[PDB]
Amino acid sequence: MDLKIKNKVCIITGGAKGIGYGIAKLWASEGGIPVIFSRSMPKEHDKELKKLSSEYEFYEIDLKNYEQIEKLVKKVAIKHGGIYALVNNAGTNDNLHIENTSTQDLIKSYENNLFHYYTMTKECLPYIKKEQGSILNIVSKTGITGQGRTSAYASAKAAQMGFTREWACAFAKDNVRVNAIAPAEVMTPLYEKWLQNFPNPKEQYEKIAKAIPLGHRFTTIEEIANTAVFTLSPLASHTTGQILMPDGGYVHLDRALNW
Amino acid sequence: MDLKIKNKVCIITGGAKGIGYGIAKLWASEGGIPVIFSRSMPKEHDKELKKLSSEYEFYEIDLKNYEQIEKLVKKVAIKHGGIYALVNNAGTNDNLHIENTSTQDLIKSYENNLFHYYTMTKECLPYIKKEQGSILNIVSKTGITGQGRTSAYASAKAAQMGFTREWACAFAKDNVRVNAIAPAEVMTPLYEKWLQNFPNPKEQYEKIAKAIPLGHRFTTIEEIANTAVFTLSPLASHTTGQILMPDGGYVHLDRALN
Amino acid sequence: MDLKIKNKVCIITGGAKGIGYGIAKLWASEGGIPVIFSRSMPKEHDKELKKLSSEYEFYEIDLKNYEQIEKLVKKVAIKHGGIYALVNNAGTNDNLHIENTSTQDLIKSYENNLFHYYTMTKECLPYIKKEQGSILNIVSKTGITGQGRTSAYASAKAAQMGFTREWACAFAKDNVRVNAIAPAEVMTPLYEKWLQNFPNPKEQYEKIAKAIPLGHRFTTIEEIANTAVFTLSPLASHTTGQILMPDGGYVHLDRALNWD
Amino acid sequence: MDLKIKNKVCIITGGAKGIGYGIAKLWASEGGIPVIFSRSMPKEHDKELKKLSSEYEFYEIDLKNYEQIEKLVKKVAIKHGGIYALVNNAGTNDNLHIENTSTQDLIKSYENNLFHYYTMTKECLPYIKKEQGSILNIVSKTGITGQGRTSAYASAKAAQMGFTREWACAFAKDNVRVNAIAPAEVMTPLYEKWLQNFPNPKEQYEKIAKAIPLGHRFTTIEEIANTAVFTLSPLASHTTGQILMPDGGYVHLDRALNWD
Ligand SMILES: NC(=O)c1ccc[n+]([C@@H]2O[C@H](COP(=O)([O-])OP(=O)(O)OC[C@H]3O[C@@H](n4cnc5c(N)ncnc54)[C@H](OP(=O)(O)O)[C@@H]3O)[C@@H](O)[C@H]2O)c1
Ligand SMILES: NC(=O)c1ccc[n+]([C@@H]2O[C@H](COP(=O)([O-])OP(=O)(O)OC[C@H]3O[C@@H](n4cnc5c(N)ncnc54)[C@H](OP(=O)(O)O)[C@@H]3O)[C@@H](O)[C@H]2O)c1
Ligand SMILES: NC(=O)c1ccc[n+]([C@@H]2O[C@H](COP(=O)([O-])OP(=O)(O)OC[C@H]3O[C@@H](n4cnc5c(N)ncnc54)[C@H](OP(=O)(O)O)[C@@H]3O)[C@@H](O)[C@H]2O)c1
Ligand SMILES: NC(=O)c1ccc[n+]([C@@H]2O[C@H](COP(=O)([O-])OP(=O)(O)OC[C@H]3O[C@@H](n4cnc5c(N)ncnc54)[C@H](OP(=O)(O)O)[C@@H]3O)[C@@H](O)[C@H]2O)c1
Ligand SMILES: [Mg+2]
Ligand SMILES: [Mg+2]
Ligand SMILES: [Mg+2]
Ligand SMILES: [Mg+2]
């Protein structure tokens, strides 16, 4: 399947690790040019990405400092000539529960998780409308299902769903598609490092994984990436406003399902 | 139908006008005790709520100053002895489009529209858990459907839908119900006045209303209030995590309906 | 709260037991007139309903014989002068799994569970349109979430959700509201008797109920009926096309939700 | 992007024309072997699929005669050695409105549109379980949003959404994925001929198409096929229970959206 993204430029926030890095590698393997906005870039990931795409660039930035975004996006546009797509992906489930988290710390969380989805989109939109491209927001099942001990993250992810539908409305006229991916549980090195923090790592993974209908296993990075990159590409050219769930049946299948 | 809310205390933010005021009246006429947090209270609304409920109170506050909330919720709880329910309703569709609104102005909208939903709920939760009460977030169609030129309002309303599900999860163990109402188009005095600014106020109303399948007309305040007050009451004792749409079919029915 | 349904006629299929009966009692208790279409009517239920409404009627019918519905609906209309509302409620989870149920037996399931939602609505529509009334479909969580061993019941319940949206579209211009209620687990006498057949009825109840976030307990019949009758009443006069879930958080809340 | 479907066998019902034929061509173009169950096969299509896959086969069947399905599916499994995927696609919007369609004609519509989704899945399941493959139901926007003059089609497509969730629950343990595609308006040669019968076919097209936010234009067959074949493929190996909308924003975007 020819995704027709060769030499198309995609900025991926938090594209240095985990899900965002999976999306970047697949974008690169398919001939697109990925540009990573993230706090740091592991040297080995930088090497793999350069090997995949000679035009790849890393821009070091903490996106809580959203005033830096206009200057950085402008550089990207000058260096490469335009921007086709944006993946808003940088975020952290910081498990801030309402009963013990101040409103001030909620706002701090929105700085780390939410505001730059707006700012990145705002500054990329001039260029993405030119190329009739794509915006993709990585949200989370928690914005839909809740979880119970993570008010700051749940509302930020739901807000990003609202942004998805709002921007799909705003730029349908422009042939710019806006979609979101809501993963449930995706195995990343950070996740594995968080499980290994447990007295019984296997038991703890099993507690989570047994609630996932398709295989009692976490979604892989590659599985999120495949759906993300397909959705970004011209091959999804009538898909917009979609909250997509490659999630093993987590959100939609009977909660009592077991085997 | 006996709603079983005689003397139950409900705080209603933005409850001085429009939708929230309709909820306060109904809450009161069914025997509940409404407590209004809002920027100001029209004299005539203050007189009407006092006739409906001798224990009703108005607390003047701009909820962008969310640090005032802890003190005010503690006062309510000391005066009446507790709090059964909270309606987070204060908000403004401020039509802030992403392409011409700064990120600083996005955050100012969230001060006006979003953060106090969290803070109000935070400070009421100890009392509402005590009474195994109800929290109701008034959200908006736009958080689900989008609109096109109101990025700050759509994300905030969608965020409030996430709060609704998150809190329903957090407090199911406590027998606290958390739901939302997503109105589409609701006729208020202030909506009527915005329409009246138009050279042709009727044409502008009809332009909007024709999109509404059930009757080509706006939802009334009473219609939002009936569903809100029923949903808050003990008669909806197994309803939680719901986003309710008393919206004339706006969100769900074929867009091409005519 | 005044629901404004005094002397309004509502036909409730399967109104003789379970959820439908709880809906019939509340309708009558709030001043409405319930008309029950069901296979049989327990004597003690006929007595309670008669005490709640002097004009309540029972019509004995098995709704797989959908050709009988036109004549039955016509007699109701002549007797009472009209019909304000219809509750399509009669149905059975027959646990017909695709891998060992024939297509023929799927169709028989639809005769029992599905076709009469259409025929009842068809024959009631002329009267409900005259009174700008209300149609309510009792569906199921399984139509949305699936279950795994009940193909016939899940597709029938999902079909009824499509009927709900389609008829809400069709009759919005007539000011006829059409909605649905999707219960999850509702404690009925038949549910309790089903549980009492297990080696350990309490432990089987708790196995099912543990998955219900709000109170680890079944929804009650009253809880369903309250949301039903409110939604039918003129007080929900801008509510249509809705699939309502008074279900304890079953459909929408995080599947991993866990509290002791 | 390597879909990893080389030599995988997919049966596509109604795959002779329109959406199903676009899915068949792309399946073959990506190395899969398509098998079409349909009423008839245009010569020009049989030639194009034969050119694309030397193992492609057509089986003439009117899927209302669902008893024929077992023998046909068994023939496919012997000939090709197995079946990896099934696309349930055959169907017709017959615009049967409740107020002038009998229950008997509703049931006839289900024979044309619904029952064979069940029978095809039932008979294909042993083979698809063996290959841990995929089932894809083509449904319709109308099963979600209603339309207003087509009760039989809206309920059938909603029932297929129920089947999608129910089968996804039933076979997750077997690593069998079950999803659905809900198109809104898709331009097919048959849709174009239908538009051409109008006094002003361009005006009628634009009346329908102006409600589609993304581009004021119908979805293409290619657009449906691409999402279909990706979702069927092993590259969507954690996607199940999904109702997917490649529909230009038809279902989810603000009904009042208006530009130019
Ligand atoms: N993994 C899951 O199970 C799961 C489930 C649902 C949703 N998600 C979503 O997936 C997205 C990516 O998460 P992940 O699981 O891939 O986590 P991850 O492995 O920690 O990767 C996140 C990346 O984003 C970067 N980042 C985060 N916040 C940033 C900020 N304010 N400025 C700059 N860089 C930032 C991180 O940088 P450093 O680590 O170097 O600071 C890291 O490179 C998130 O939006 C999350 O909501 C993940
Ligand atoms: N009306 C509709 O068609 C519609 C549609 C969808 C959603 N909604 C939702 O309904 C809710 C109420 O809207 P409405 O139409 O009833 O508006 P409204 O008639 O203008 O009333 C809003 C009330 O909230 C108050 N308020 C707003 N922000 C506040 C703040 N930061 N602090 C204190 N008070 C504040 C206003 O006070 P002042 O005016 O005195 O400042 C006013 O009393 C909103 O959350 C909105 O999202 C309404
Ligand atoms: N209870 C739950 O947990 C639950 C959960 C989700 C959805 N629901 C839905 O709620 C509705 C009512 O179920 P329920 O739990 O109240 O069941 P129930 O206690 O068995 O009551 C059903 C009533 O409907 C009657 N009935 C069923 N099929 C009929 C037919 N073809 N013709 C005439 N009468 C018929 C039954 O009569 P006989 O018993 O005399 O045959 C019985 O009186 C059903 O549509 C079901 O799908 C229930
Ligand atoms: N096109 C749209 O705008 C649209 C929108 C939403 C959903 N859909 C869905 O997409 C699917 C395909 O429709 P389409 O638009 O591609 O229609 P189409 O162009 O008419 O193609 C339908 C194909 O299926 C065949 N077929 C239908 N019923 C059959 C039966 N009982 N037995 C055997 N073959 C049968 C037809 O055969 P003959 O024509 O030779 O009889 C034809 O080859 C349908 O399930 C429909 O619900 C389409
Ligand atoms: Mg920085
Ligand atoms: Mg103040
Ligand atoms: Mg009979
Ligand atoms: Mg045949």
mmCIF file of N, CA, C and O in Angstrom, chain B residues 1 3 30 165 168-169 172-173 175 177 212-214 217 219 223 226-227 230 235 237-242 245-249 252-254 257, chain C residues 1 3 26 30 165 168-169 172 175 177 212-214 217 219 223 226-227 230 235 237-240 242 245-249 252-254 257 259:
data_model
loop_
_atom_site.group_PDB
_atom_site.id
_atom_site.type_symbol
_atom_site.label_atom_id
_atom_site.label_comp_id
_atom_site.label_asym_id
_atom_site.label_seq_id
_atom_site.Cartn_x
_atom_site.Cartn_y
_atom_site.Cartn_z
ATOM 1 N N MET B 1 -45.111 13.296 40.868
ATOM 2 C CA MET B 1 -43.856 12.604 41.157
ATOM 3 C C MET B 1 -43.111 13.309 42.288
ATOM 4 O O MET B 1 -42.773 14.490 42.161
ATOM 5 N N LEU B 3 -39.959 14.014 44.143
ATOM 6 C CA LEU B 3 -38.531 13.950 43.844
ATOM 7 C C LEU B 3 -37.652 13.693 45.063
ATOM 8 O O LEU B 3 -36.463 13.415 44.885
ATOM 9 N N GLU B 30 -39.695 22.548 44.144
ATOM 10 C CA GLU B 30 -39.801 21.163 44.584
ATOM 11 C C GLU B 30 -39.339 20.953 46.031
ATOM 12 O O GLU B 30 -39.209 19.798 46.470
ATOM 13 N N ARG B 165 -16.922 12.061 33.612
ATOM 14 C CA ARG B 165 -16.640 10.628 33.650
ATOM 15 C C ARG B 165 -15.586 10.295 34.698
ATOM 16 O O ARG B 165 -15.687 9.267 35.376
ATOM 17 N N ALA B 168 -17.357 10.541 38.076
ATOM 18 C CA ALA B 168 -18.249 9.396 38.219
ATOM 19 C C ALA B 168 -17.461 8.158 38.625
ATOM 20 O O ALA B 168 -17.913 7.374 39.466
ATOM 21 N N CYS B 169 -16.273 7.969 38.040
ATOM 22 C CA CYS B 169 -15.417 6.855 38.447
ATOM 23 C C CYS B 169 -14.960 7.017 39.890
ATOM 24 O O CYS B 169 -15.065 6.085 40.697
ATOM 25 N N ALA B 172 -18.141 6.703 42.540
ATOM 26 C CA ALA B 172 -19.116 5.617 42.539
ATOM 27 C C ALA B 172 -19.065 4.850 43.857
ATOM 28 O O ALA B 172 -20.108 4.506 44.433
ATOM 29 N N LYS B 173 -17.853 4.620 44.375
ATOM 30 C CA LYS B 173 -17.699 3.941 45.660
ATOM 31 C C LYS B 173 -18.416 4.674 46.786
ATOM 32 O O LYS B 173 -18.783 4.049 47.787
ATOM 33 N N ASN B 175 -21.277 6.396 46.507
ATOM 34 C CA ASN B 175 -22.658 6.642 46.113
ATOM 35 C C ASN B 175 -22.886 8.115 45.767
ATOM 36 O O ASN B 175 -23.927 8.704 46.091
ATOM 37 N N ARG B 177 -23.323 10.450 42.523
ATOM 38 C CA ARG B 177 -23.573 10.466 41.083
ATOM 39 C C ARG B 177 -23.050 11.749 40.435
ATOM 40 O O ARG B 177 -23.228 12.847 40.971
ATOM 41 N N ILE B 212 -32.859 22.489 14.094
ATOM 42 C CA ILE B 212 -33.245 21.712 15.270
ATOM 43 C C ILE B 212 -34.402 20.797 14.876
ATOM 44 O O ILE B 212 -35.517 21.291 14.640
ATOM 45 N N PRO B 213 -34.199 19.478 14.816
ATOM 46 C CA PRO B 213 -35.261 18.596 14.296
ATOM 47 C C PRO B 213 -36.593 18.700 15.032
ATOM 48 O O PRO B 213 -37.642 18.800 14.383
ATOM 49 N N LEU B 214 -36.595 18.679 16.360
ATOM 50 C CA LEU B 214 -37.854 18.638 17.100
ATOM 51 C C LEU B 214 -38.421 20.053 17.186
ATOM 52 O O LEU B 214 -38.122 20.815 18.105
ATOM 53 N N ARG B 217 -37.286 24.795 16.788
ATOM 54 C CA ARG B 217 -37.314 25.814 17.823
ATOM 55 C C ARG B 217 -36.260 25.496 18.875
ATOM 56 O O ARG B 217 -35.764 24.370 18.977
ATOM 57 N N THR B 219 -34.639 24.862 22.561
ATOM 58 C CA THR B 219 -35.008 24.292 23.852
ATOM 59 C C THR B 219 -35.354 25.408 24.826
ATOM 60 O O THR B 219 -34.738 26.478 24.812
ATOM 61 N N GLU B 223 -37.212 23.088 30.052
ATOM 62 C CA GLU B 223 -36.846 21.762 29.570
ATOM 63 C C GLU B 223 -35.466 21.342 30.072
ATOM 64 O O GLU B 223 -35.267 20.187 30.467
ATOM 65 N N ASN B 226 -36.054 20.721 33.992
ATOM 66 C CA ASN B 226 -36.737 19.484 34.360
ATOM 67 C C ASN B 226 -35.777 18.307 34.326
ATOM 68 O O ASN B 226 -35.711 17.514 35.272
ATOM 69 N N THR B 227 -35.015 18.177 33.241
ATOM 70 C CA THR B 227 -34.080 17.063 33.161
ATOM 71 C C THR B 227 -32.968 17.197 34.199
ATOM 72 O O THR B 227 -32.583 16.209 34.831
ATOM 73 N N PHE B 230 -34.594 16.396 37.784
ATOM 74 C CA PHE B 230 -34.842 14.961 37.867
ATOM 75 C C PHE B 230 -33.534 14.190 38.028
ATOM 76 O O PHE B 230 -33.415 13.308 38.887
ATOM 77 N N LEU B 235 -34.404 10.150 42.571
ATOM 78 C CA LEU B 235 -35.175 9.316 41.657
ATOM 79 C C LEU B 235 -34.338 8.821 40.487
ATOM 80 O O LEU B 235 -34.754 7.888 39.795
ATOM 81 N N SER B 237 -31.322 7.370 40.959
ATOM 82 C CA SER B 237 -30.281 6.879 41.870
ATOM 83 C C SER B 237 -29.327 5.865 41.241
ATOM 84 O O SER B 237 -28.368 5.462 41.918
ATOM 85 N N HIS B 238 -29.526 5.433 39.992
ATOM 86 C CA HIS B 238 -28.524 4.588 39.350
ATOM 87 C C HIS B 238 -27.964 5.236 38.092
ATOM 88 O O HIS B 238 -27.307 4.550 37.302
ATOM 89 N N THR B 239 -28.230 6.529 37.872
ATOM 90 C CA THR B 239 -27.701 7.291 36.735
ATOM 91 C C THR B 239 -26.403 7.993 37.149
ATOM 92 O O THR B 239 -26.421 8.869 38.020
ATOM 93 N N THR B 240 -25.279 7.631 36.515
ATOM 94 C CA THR B 240 -24.001 8.307 36.744
ATOM 95 C C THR B 240 -23.135 8.174 35.493
ATOM 96 O O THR B 240 -23.329 7.272 34.673
ATOM 97 N N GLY B 241 -22.191 9.101 35.350
ATOM 98 C CA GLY B 241 -21.337 9.153 34.181
ATOM 99 C C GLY B 241 -22.043 9.487 32.885
ATOM 100 O O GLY B 241 -21.480 9.263 31.809
ATOM 101 N N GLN B 242 -23.266 10.011 32.946
ATOM 102 C CA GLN B 242 -24.057 10.251 31.743
ATOM 103 C C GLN B 242 -23.838 11.662 31.213
ATOM 104 O O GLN B 242 -23.739 12.618 31.988
ATOM 105 N N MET B 245 -28.649 14.643 26.671
ATOM 106 C CA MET B 245 -28.936 15.559 25.562
ATOM 107 C C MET B 245 -30.425 15.818 25.426
ATOM 108 O O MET B 245 -31.083 15.212 24.571
ATOM 109 N N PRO B 246 -30.985 16.724 26.227
ATOM 110 C CA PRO B 246 -32.320 17.271 25.917
ATOM 111 C C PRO B 246 -32.153 18.454 24.958
ATOM 112 O O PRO B 246 -32.139 19.630 25.341
ATOM 113 N N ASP B 247 -32.003 18.130 23.666
ATOM 114 C CA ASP B 247 -31.511 19.082 22.674
ATOM 115 C C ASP B 247 -32.331 19.074 21.383
ATOM 116 O O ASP B 247 -31.865 19.594 20.361
ATOM 117 N N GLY B 248 -33.537 18.500 21.397
ATOM 118 C CA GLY B 248 -34.339 18.466 20.188
ATOM 119 C C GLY B 248 -33.804 17.597 19.064
ATOM 120 O O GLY B 248 -34.216 17.764 17.914
ATOM 121 N N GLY B 249 -32.910 16.661 19.358
ATOM 122 C CA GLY B 249 -32.332 15.826 18.327
ATOM 123 C C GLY B 249 -31.121 16.410 17.640
ATOM 124 O O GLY B 249 -30.675 15.846 16.639
ATOM 125 N N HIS B 252 -27.808 13.989 17.596
ATOM 126 C CA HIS B 252 -27.855 12.578 17.217
ATOM 127 C C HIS B 252 -28.548 12.281 15.903
ATOM 128 O O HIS B 252 -28.218 11.269 15.285
ATOM 129 N N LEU B 253 -29.477 13.123 15.451
ATOM 130 C CA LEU B 253 -30.297 12.807 14.286
ATOM 131 C C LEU B 253 -29.639 13.279 12.992
ATOM 132 O O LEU B 253 -28.857 14.233 12.985
ATOM 133 N N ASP B 254 -29.963 12.590 11.896
ATOM 134 C CA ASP B 254 -29.429 12.872 10.563
ATOM 135 C C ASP B 254 -29.274 14.374 10.324
ATOM 136 O O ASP B 254 -30.242 15.137 10.436
ATOM 137 N N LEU B 257 -31.700 16.251 7.958
ATOM 138 C CA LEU B 257 -33.121 16.363 8.262
ATOM 139 C C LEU B 257 -33.639 17.769 7.946
ATOM 140 O O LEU B 257 -32.968 18.773 8.209
ATOM 141 N N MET C 1 -43.229 16.938 41.786
ATOM 142 C CA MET C 1 -43.136 17.243 40.354
ATOM 143 C C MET C 1 -44.364 16.723 39.593
ATOM 144 O O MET C 1 -44.726 15.549 39.705
ATOM 145 N N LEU C 3 -45.969 15.527 36.414
ATOM 146 C CA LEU C 3 -45.569 14.974 35.123
ATOM 147 C C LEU C 3 -46.575 15.248 34.017
ATOM 148 O O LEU C 3 -46.260 15.001 32.847
ATOM 149 N N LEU C 26 -45.911 2.804 37.788
ATOM 150 C CA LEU C 26 -45.594 4.210 37.993
ATOM 151 C C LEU C 26 -46.462 5.101 37.119
ATOM 152 O O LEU C 26 -46.873 6.187 37.546
ATOM 153 N N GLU C 30 -48.940 7.815 38.777
ATOM 154 C CA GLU C 30 -48.839 9.226 38.444
ATOM 155 C C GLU C 30 -50.067 9.748 37.694
ATOM 156 O O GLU C 30 -50.036 10.874 37.182
ATOM 157 N N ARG C 165 -33.617 5.881 16.579
ATOM 158 C CA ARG C 165 -33.108 7.037 15.851
ATOM 159 C C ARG C 165 -33.907 7.279 14.572
ATOM 160 O O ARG C 165 -34.216 8.426 14.232
ATOM 161 N N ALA C 168 -37.330 8.708 15.509
ATOM 162 C CA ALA C 168 -37.174 10.075 15.992
ATOM 163 C C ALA C 168 -37.007 11.044 14.822
ATOM 164 O O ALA C 168 -37.612 12.121 14.813
ATOM 165 N N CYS C 169 -36.220 10.657 13.810
ATOM 166 C CA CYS C 169 -36.131 11.434 12.568
ATOM 167 C C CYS C 169 -37.488 11.538 11.883
ATOM 168 O O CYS C 169 -37.893 12.612 11.429
ATOM 169 N N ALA C 172 -40.217 13.800 14.187
ATOM 170 C CA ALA C 172 -39.902 15.082 14.809
ATOM 171 C C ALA C 172 -40.820 16.182 14.289
ATOM 172 O O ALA C 172 -41.281 17.035 15.054
ATOM 173 N N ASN C 175 -43.970 16.380 16.077
ATOM 174 C CA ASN C 175 -43.808 16.517 17.514
ATOM 175 C C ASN C 175 -44.144 15.210 18.231
ATOM 176 O O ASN C 175 -44.854 15.186 19.240
ATOM 177 N N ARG C 177 -41.991 12.323 20.095
ATOM 178 C CA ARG C 177 -40.662 12.015 20.612
ATOM 179 C C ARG C 177 -40.480 10.503 20.663
ATOM 180 O O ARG C 177 -41.403 9.771 21.040
ATOM 181 N N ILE C 212 -20.580 -3.609 38.498
ATOM 182 C CA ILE C 212 -21.466 -2.456 38.368
ATOM 183 C C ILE C 212 -20.903 -1.350 39.255
ATOM 184 O O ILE C 212 -20.992 -1.461 40.487
ATOM 185 N N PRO C 213 -20.327 -0.287 38.685
ATOM 186 C CA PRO C 213 -19.571 0.672 39.513
ATOM 187 C C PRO C 213 -20.374 1.332 40.628
ATOM 188 O O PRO C 213 -19.850 1.498 41.736
ATOM 189 N N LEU C 214 -21.626 1.713 40.384
ATOM 190 C CA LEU C 214 -22.391 2.465 41.378
ATOM 191 C C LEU C 214 -23.027 1.490 42.377
ATOM 192 O O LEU C 214 -24.134 0.980 42.181
ATOM 193 N N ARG C 217 -24.315 -3.161 42.714
ATOM 194 C CA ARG C 217 -25.643 -3.708 42.913
ATOM 195 C C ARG C 217 -26.452 -3.503 41.648
ATOM 196 O O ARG C 217 -26.163 -2.606 40.849
ATOM 197 N N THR C 219 -29.415 -2.491 39.115
ATOM 198 C CA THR C 219 -30.421 -1.441 39.021
ATOM 199 C C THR C 219 -31.761 -1.983 39.514
ATOM 200 O O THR C 219 -32.062 -3.163 39.359
ATOM 201 N N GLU C 223 -35.927 2.283 39.538
ATOM 202 C CA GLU C 223 -34.981 3.192 38.895
ATOM 203 C C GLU C 223 -35.215 3.254 37.388
ATOM 204 O O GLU C 223 -35.200 4.339 36.798
ATOM 205 N N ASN C 226 -38.715 5.130 36.793
ATOM 206 C CA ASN C 226 -38.647 6.582 37.000
ATOM 207 C C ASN C 226 -38.123 7.294 35.761
ATOM 208 O O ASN C 226 -38.750 8.238 35.260
ATOM 209 N N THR C 227 -36.964 6.856 35.253
ATOM 210 C CA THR C 227 -36.421 7.458 34.040
ATOM 211 C C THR C 227 -37.345 7.222 32.847
ATOM 212 O O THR C 227 -37.493 8.099 31.986
ATOM 213 N N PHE C 230 -40.618 9.683 33.354
ATOM 214 C CA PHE C 230 -40.181 11.057 33.129
ATOM 215 C C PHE C 230 -39.918 11.310 31.653
ATOM 216 O O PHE C 230 -40.395 12.305 31.091
ATOM 217 N N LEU C 235 -42.731 16.528 30.366
ATOM 218 C CA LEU C 235 -41.632 17.260 30.982
ATOM 219 C C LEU C 235 -40.308 17.030 30.271
ATOM 220 O O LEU C 235 -39.366 17.800 30.487
ATOM 221 N N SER C 237 -39.980 17.326 26.962
ATOM 222 C CA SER C 237 -40.589 17.697 25.686
ATOM 223 C C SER C 237 -39.584 18.088 24.611
ATOM 224 O O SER C 237 -40.003 18.339 23.477
ATOM 225 N N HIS C 238 -38.285 18.152 24.903
ATOM 226 C CA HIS C 238 -37.336 18.351 23.814
ATOM 227 C C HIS C 238 -36.342 17.192 23.728
ATOM 228 O O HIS C 238 -35.313 17.306 23.057
ATOM 229 N N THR C 239 -36.650 16.069 24.385
ATOM 230 C CA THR C 239 -35.806 14.875 24.391
ATOM 231 C C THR C 239 -36.304 13.869 23.351
ATOM 232 O O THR C 239 -37.422 13.351 23.467
ATOM 233 N N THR C 240 -35.477 13.592 22.337
ATOM 234 C CA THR C 240 -35.822 12.614 21.313
ATOM 235 C C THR C 240 -34.534 12.076 20.706
ATOM 236 O O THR C 240 -33.491 12.735 20.745
ATOM 237 N N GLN C 242 -32.852 9.765 22.009
ATOM 238 C CA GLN C 242 -31.907 9.442 23.063
ATOM 239 C C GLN C 242 -31.939 7.958 23.394
ATOM 240 O O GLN C 242 -33.010 7.353 23.491
ATOM 241 N N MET C 245 -29.208 5.605 29.593
ATOM 242 C CA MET C 245 -28.583 4.542 30.372
ATOM 243 C C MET C 245 -28.613 4.837 31.864
ATOM 244 O O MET C 245 -27.663 5.408 32.421
ATOM 245 N N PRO C 246 -29.709 4.474 32.545
ATOM 246 C CA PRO C 246 -29.670 4.390 34.005
ATOM 247 C C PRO C 246 -29.153 3.012 34.373
ATOM 248 O O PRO C 246 -29.938 2.071 34.553
ATOM 249 N N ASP C 247 -27.819 2.878 34.442
ATOM 250 C CA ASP C 247 -27.195 1.560 34.469
ATOM 251 C C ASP C 247 -26.055 1.432 35.480
ATOM 252 O O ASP C 247 -25.316 0.442 35.423
ATOM 253 N N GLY C 248 -25.894 2.382 36.406
ATOM 254 C CA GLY C 248 -24.835 2.286 37.396
ATOM 255 C C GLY C 248 -23.437 2.553 36.868
ATOM 256 O O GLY C 248 -22.450 2.211 37.540
ATOM 257 N N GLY C 249 -23.315 3.170 35.690
ATOM 258 C CA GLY C 249 -22.019 3.372 35.067
ATOM 259 C C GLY C 249 -21.534 2.208 34.236
ATOM 260 O O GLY C 249 -20.367 2.207 33.823
ATOM 261 N N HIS C 252 -20.380 3.173 30.386
ATOM 262 C CA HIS C 252 -19.486 4.273 30.044
ATOM 263 C C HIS C 252 -18.241 4.371 30.904
ATOM 264 O O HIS C 252 -17.301 5.062 30.504
ATOM 265 N N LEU C 253 -18.211 3.750 32.076
ATOM 266 C CA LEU C 253 -17.111 3.974 33.005
ATOM 267 C C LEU C 253 -16.015 2.935 32.802
ATOM 268 O O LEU C 253 -16.278 1.813 32.356
ATOM 269 N N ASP C 254 -14.776 3.329 33.117
ATOM 270 C CA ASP C 254 -13.582 2.501 32.930
ATOM 271 C C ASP C 254 -13.821 1.052 33.348
ATOM 272 O O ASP C 254 -14.198 0.774 34.494
ATOM 273 N N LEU C 257 -12.443 -0.274 36.615
ATOM 274 C CA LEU C 257 -12.885 0.314 37.877
ATOM 275 C C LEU C 257 -13.050 -0.737 38.968
ATOM 276 O O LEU C 257 -13.734 -1.751 38.786
ATOM 277 N N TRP C 259 -13.282 -1.131 43.351
ATOM 278 C CA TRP C 259 -13.297 -0.702 44.745
ATOM 279 C C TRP C 259 -13.831 -1.834 45.614
ATOM 280 O O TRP C 259 -14.658 -2.638 45.175
#
